[PDB]
From a paper:
Pseudomonas aeruginosa CtpA is a carboxyl-terminal processing protease that partners with the outer membrane lipoprotein LbcA to degrade at least five cell wall-associated proteins, four of which are cell wall hydrolases. Instead, it requires the adaptor protein LbcA, the lipoprotein-binding partner of CtpA, for activity in vivo and in vitro. Therefore, it appears that LbcA interacts with CtpA to assemble an active proteolytic complex, which controls the activity of these enzymes by degrading them. We show that CtpA alone assembles as an inactive trimer of dimers and that LbcA is a right-handed spiral that might wrap around a substrate protein.
We then produced selenomethionine-substituted CtpA crystals for single-wavelength anomalous diffraction (SAD)-based phasing. The derivatized crystals diffracted to 3.3 Å, leading to successful structural solution. There are two CtpA molecules in one asymmetric unit (ASU), and CtpA formed a hexamer that comprised a trimer of dimers in crystal. As expected, each CtpA protomer consists of an N-terminal dimerization region (NDR), a PDZ domain, a cap domain, a protease core domain, and a C-terminal dimerization region (CDR). The PDZ domain is partially disordered, but we generated a homolog PDZ model based on the CtpB structure and accurately docked the domain guided by two anomalous density peaks from selenomethionine residues 153 and 160 of the domain. The CtpA catalytic Ser-302 is located at the end of the narrow tunnel between the cap and the body region. The PDZ domain is in a position that blocks the narrow substrate peptide tunnel leading to Ser-302. Furthermore, the catalytic triad Ser-302–Lys-327–Gln-331 is well beyond hydrogen-bonding distance: Ser-302 and Lys-327 are 4.2 Å apart, and Lys-327 and Gln-331 are 9.1 Å apart. By superimposing the two proteases, we found that transition to the active form requires the CtpA cap domain to clamp down toward the catalytic site by 11 Å and also a large-scale movement of the associated PDZ domain by 12 Å. However, the six unhinged CDRs of three CtpA dimers interact to form the triangular trimer-of-dimer complex.
Numbering used by the authors:
A (entry chain B), C (entry chain B), E (entry chain B): 41 to 87, 191 to 377, 411 to 434
B (entry chain A), D (entry chain A), F (entry chain A): 41 to 87, 191 to 376, 411 to 435
The structure:
C-alpha cells in the first residue's frame, strides 16, 4: 500500500464519481480501473485434420502442420514413416510447412520437434514465479533419420509452430525460409483472487534453445522469400506455390552438392 | 473512499505485481489503473466561407453549411434573403446541405436552426455537473418564410450539424435524407486535480427536442439515399445523386401540395 | 374567286404546260397543285395486349399503357382493382408508363383519365367548323382511390397518351417525369367534294384542361429525367430502368413525407 | 385555261379555306398551290487541277478527272500523250477515275469522251422547248490510241461524268467498274413569268448513245466492285481496292489478248 | 592431270595430315576433299490424294494440285470432266492452285500441261552430255476446252509445278498471279565411278518454252498478289483465301469483258 | 602421296568435269576440293573493366568476370581481398559469374582458376604438332581462403571461361549452376604453305583436369537453373533468378555445415 499514490488515485476516482454524465458507484469505477490496468499492462491479460503429408517428387517430400492438436505428434511420425514407404527408400529432402499455424498444444509441439532432434534443448519457459521456469530436452530418437529439411514460416506462424521452428533453427537442423514470424511467445496463467473472480495474466515467456525470446524477436528465416512470380527467358503444388518451389529447389541443390 | 472494496483492488494489484513476467513497480500499476479507468469509462476521456447558396432551378434553391463558424448564422440569413431575391419570389423548395460537417460553434448551430423555427425547443444538454444543464428554444422569427426544405446528412456530419438536423426533424420542420450520421453529441470538460495534472471527462451530452440522445442514437434520416454519381447520356443536381433526389422530392411535393 | 391571283396561277400553269420535258395535260397539273397545296399547308393533310400491370414492390405498383384500344379503359380499371388485390391492401404509390405510346382511341384515353379524376375538365377540341368544339369532363368515380401516381412520358408519347398526361398534370393529380413529349395534338377529318374524291384535313386541335395546345407545346414533365447510369460510392424492372427507378424512389419519398 | 376543271380546283380550295383549323387567306393557298405544283412535278423545280495522271506500272497508267472545267479537255489530252512518253511506248492499259465527280462543263465532257472515240454519238438531250434538242457526235481523232481502258464510277459521280461514262460504255469502248452512279442527268432552265418572278423548270434531259436516260437509269457498271482498303502483310493500287481490281483486270486482259 | 595444281593440292593435304589434332590417313582426307568439292560446286550434288477439284461458284471452278504423282495426269483430266458435269455446262473460269507444290514426276507435269495445251513446246532440258537435251511438245488434245484459267504460285512452288506454270505462261494460256516461285529447276543424275561408289550430279536444267531458265529466274506471276486483308467501306474457300478470291474476281471480270 | 588412290580422286574429278551442267575448269575444281577438304574436316579451318565484385549479403559476396584480359587475374585477387575487407571477416559464400564470357587470355584464365586452387591440374592441351602439348598446374596459394563458391555458367561462356569452370568442377572446388556452355575448346594455328597462302587448322584442343574434352562435352553444370526474372510483390539477387538460387544454395549450405 503506497497510500500517497492511493490518495492520488482515490482523488481522481472521486472527481470522476462527481462529474461524469451518468452516475457511477465506487464498484464500477474500481472494476474499470482494474480492467484498464490490465489492458494497459498486457494485451493478453483479462479479469479437423492436423497433419498432411505428400511425396511431391521422387526423393523429396512435403509435411504440413495445419495446427497443433494432441494427436499431432503421433501423426507427424506416422507421416514420416509413410513418406519413407511412399518413396520406397530413404528420403533426399523434406519440407516442413509451419506457415499459417497459430499454435496449439505445447507438448505436441515439443514432440513434433523431437521427431527431428536426438539431443539438446528444445524450448524453455522463463518467468518470475515458483513453477514457471521450464525446460524441454530432445530424446535420443528421431524418426526423421537425419533427413535434410527446410521449414517454411509466414507471418501467421506463432506460438507452438514458432517454438518448433526456433528449436529446429538453433540446433542447426533445418533451413528456415520465408518471411518473418508472428512473434507471439507468452504464456497466460489464470490466478485466483480472494474475491469470487480471477484474473488471467501472462506469467512467463518462451525462449528458444539459443536464448532468444520468441515474443520480442520472432523467428527470422535464414533465407527471406516473399511471394513472387518467376518468368522464364530461355498432385503437384510447387508449380503454384513460390515458397514451396524455392524450398524444393534448395533441397535439390543441397542433395546434389552433398 | 470505501476501504473495504479498496482491499479487493489492492489485493488484485498486489497479485498482478507478483505474477507479471517483467517486474513493474507500484507507481506504473497505479498510473495504468488511472489511465484505464478513464479509457474504459469513456473513450474521449484522458489524463473558408461557412455558407454557400445557389438557386438550383426556378423556385428551388440550395444552401450548404461547410462549417459552423460565428459568421455562419448571419451568413445563412444573408443567404436566405438573397435566394428570395434570386428567385424574384417565394421559394418552392430548399435543400440544406449539412453533409461533411464536423460541427462548430454551438450558438451558430442554434442560430441556423432558429432561421427555420418559430417555436419550440432546439437542443438541450443533460449532465450532472453544476452548470451544464442548458436549453435552447427557438425565437418566433424564421427567415425561411416557411419554405419546405429537405436536409441532407451523411456519416461525416456530427455535433452542431447533428443538433441542427435533429432539431429540424423532431420539430417536423424538415425531411432528412441521406445516410446515418456520426453521432458525436457529448461535451468534455477538463477537470483540475489536486496534483498539477488534469483529466478530460464528458460532463454532459446533447439531446434533440424529442429527447433522443445524439450520442447514442445519432440522427437517422427519414429517407435513406446513399452517395452516387449520375452520368447523363452550373447544375450540381445533374452530377449529385442525393441532391438530385432531394430536388425531385421537393418538386413532386410542391406539385401534390397544390 | 380572286381571279387576278387565279390569272397568275393559270399563267404559271401554262408556262409549265409548255416547257416541261414530258408533256402534261391540264388535269395532272391541277392535281399536283392540289397535292402540293395540301403538303405545304399541313403535313397530315392528303387528297395485342393494351395494358400491363404489376406490383413492383410491396405497396408500390406499375401500370403501363402500350397502346390505346377500345378495351383499354376497362382493362386499366381491371388492373387497378387487380393491383389493389395483389398488395392485399390500399396502394402507397403507382406509376403510369405512358411513354412509347403513339396514341389511339380518344374515348379510351378519356376513360383512362376518368379512372383517376373525380371532377373537372379532361380535354377539349377547338377548331373553326360546326361540330369541332368538344369538351370532356371527368365523372365522379375514380377507381384509383386517390393513389399518388407519377406518369412517365418519352419522346414517343403522342395523341391520346399526351391527352391523358396533360389532363393528369393540369388537375395536379400526377407527377409527370421523363423527357418532353411528341406534341402531336391535331384531328384530321375527311371532307367530301363535289367531284368523286375527298380530302383529309386537320379540322381542329386538342387542348388540355388548362388551355395549352398539345400540338404546339407538347407535354413538359414536372421533373426532367433523361436516361442515365448511377454509380454507387458507398420480376423487378426498376433495377434496369432508370426512369422507373427514379419514379419509384420519388413515390417512396412522397409516401414517407406524407 | 379550261374553266370546267377550274371549278373543281376552286371548289377544293374553298373547302380547304373553310375547314382548316387556323384561317388562311386566298393568297397563301394560291401561292402554296403554285409551290407544290412545282414541288410535286419536279424536285429540282422552284419559284484545283482538273486532271491528274500517273503511270501505275510499266505499260499501265492512271488518269483521274477531279472535276470538269474548261481546261479539262486540253489537260486530258496533254496527260494522254504525257503518259505515252512516260511509258516510252504504247500503253497496255489505262484507268479512267471518274469517281467523286459531280460534273462540270458539258463541252469539256464531250471533249473528254472524244479523246477516246473515233465515231458515233456521245450524248444527246431530249426536251420539248424550242432550242434544247442537241446532239454530240465524236470526231475521228482519239488521242487514246485505242488503249484498252477501265472506267471507275461510284455513287458520287453525276451529270457530265455520267455522260462520259455512259458514252464510253454504250460505244463498247471501255469497261465500267465500281458501284452505281448518282443519276443526275437533267437540265433546268429558268423561265420568266409575266409578274416579276420566275420558275426553275427542267426543260430537257440527257441520254447516252444507247438511248438510256441518265436521270432514270443512271449508269450501271459492267463489274460491281465496292470500295475497300487493302493492307499488305508511290503505288495507289497497293492501297485502293477498286483501282487494284481494274489494274489486275487490265493486266489479265492484256495477257489473254496476246 | 594438271600435276602442278595436283602438287599444290597434295602439299596442302600433307600439311593437314601432319598438323591436325586427331590423326587422319590419306583416304579420309581424299574423301573429305571430294565431298567438299561437291558441296562447294552444287548444293544438290552428293557422293495421299494428288488432285482436288471443286466448283466454287456457278460457272467458276477450282483445281488444286497438291503434288505430282503418276496418277496426277489422269486425275486432273478426270477432274476437268467432273467440273464440267458439276456446272451442268461449259465453264466460265478455272483456277489452278499450284502453290505449295514441291514438284514431282516430270511426265505427270507434262501431261497436266497437255490438258491445257493443243500445240507448242512445254518444257525442254539443256545440259552438256549425250542424253540430256530433251524437249516436250503439247499434243493436239486439251480437255480444258480452252477455258480461261488463272494459275496461283507461291514461294513453295518448284520443279514440276514450276514447269507447268512456265509452260502455261509462255503459251499465253493462263494468268499467273501470286508471289514469285522457288526457282528449283535442275535435274540430278547419278553417275557411276570405277570405284564401287557413285556420285549424284546436276547434269542439266529445265527451260520453259520461251527459253528462260527456271533455275535462275524462277516463275514471276503476271500479277503480284501477296497475302492481305480487305476492309469494306461501303464449301466456299475464297471467303478465307485472299489469292483465291482475287483470282476468282479476275476471272469474273474477264468473263464479263469477253 | 599414294598415287593409287590419287587415281580414284582424279577419275572422280574428271567425271565431275565432264558431267556438270555449266563447264568448270580444272583449277576451280581443285580449289573447291581444297576448300571443302578443310571445311568438311574442321568448321574452324579456312584457306571495359574485366572483373566487378560486390558483397550481396553480410557474409556472401559476388564476383563477375566480364572478360578475360591481362589485368583480370590481378583484379580478381584485388577483388577477393577487397570483399574480405567489405564483409570485415571471412566469407560464408561466394558466387563466380562466368556467364556471357566468350573467353580471353589463357594465362589470365589459369590465374583466375589458381586464385581458388592449392594443388592439382588446371587445364592441358592435347594435339599432334611439335610444341602444342602444354599443361597448367595450380600453385599452392589460393586468395579465396577456401570459401565455398558456386559458379554460374550459361550457353554464352566459352574457351577460357569454360577452362576455369571445368577446372573448378573437376577439382571438386566449386558447384556449377546454370545451363550448358558453348563448348569452344580448340586452338587454331595458321600454317604456312609453299605457295604464298596459308591454312587455318586446329592443332590441339583443351582438356579439363578430369580428362573431358571441352570441345566435345562442354561443361555441364551440376545444377540446371535456366534464366528467369523474379518480381517481388542495390540487390541483384532480388532481380536475378540464377544468382538468387546460387545465393540461397550457399546460405543453406552454410547453415547445414555448422
Amino acid at each position: 500500500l503506497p497510500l500517497d499514490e492511493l490518495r492520488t488515485f482515490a482523488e481522481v476516482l472521486d472527481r470522476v464519481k462527481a462529474a461524469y454524465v451518468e452516475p457511477v458507484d465506487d464498484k464500477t469505477l474500481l472494476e474499470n480501473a482494474i480492467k484498464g490496468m490490465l489492458s494497459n499492462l498486457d494485451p493478453h491479460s483479462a479479469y479437423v485434420k492436423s497433419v498432411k503429408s505428400q511425396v511431391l517428387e521422387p526423393g523429396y517430400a512435403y509435411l504440413r502442420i495445419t495446427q497443433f492438436q494432441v494427436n499431432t505428434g503421433e501423426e507427424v511420425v506416422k507421416a514420416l514413416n509413410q513418406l519413407r514407404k511412399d518413396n520406397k527408400g530413404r528420403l533426399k529432402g523434406l519440407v516442413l510447412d509451419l506457415r499459417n499455424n497459430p499454435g496449439g498444444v505445447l507438448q505436441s509441439a515439443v514432440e513434433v520437434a523431437d521427431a527431428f532432434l536426438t539431443k539438446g534443448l528444445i524450448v524453455y519457459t522463463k518467468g518470475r514465479i515458483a513453477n514457471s521456469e521450464l525446460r524441454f530436452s530432445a530424446d535420443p530418437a528421431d524418426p526423421s533419420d537425419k533427413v535434410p529439411l527446410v521449414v517454411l514460416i509466414n507471418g501467421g506462424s506463432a506460438s507452438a509452430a514458432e517454438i518448433v521452428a526456433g528449436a529446429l533453427q538453433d540446433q542447426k537442423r533445418a533451413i528456415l525460409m520465408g518471411t518473418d514470424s508472428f512473434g507471439k511467445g507468452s504464456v497466460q496463467t489464470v490466478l485466483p483472487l480472494n474475491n469470487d473472480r480471477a484474473l488471467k495474466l501472462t506469467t512467463a515467456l518462451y525462449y528458444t534453445p539459443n536464448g532468444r525470446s520468441i515474443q520480442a524477436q520472432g523467428i527470422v528465416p535464414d533465407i527471406e522469400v516473399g511471394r513472387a512470380k518467376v518468368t522464364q527467358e530461355r498432385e503437384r503444388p510447387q508449380d503454384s506455390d513460390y515458397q514451396l518451389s524455392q524450398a524444393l529447389s534448395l533441397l535439390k541443390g543441397l542433395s546434389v552438392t552433398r
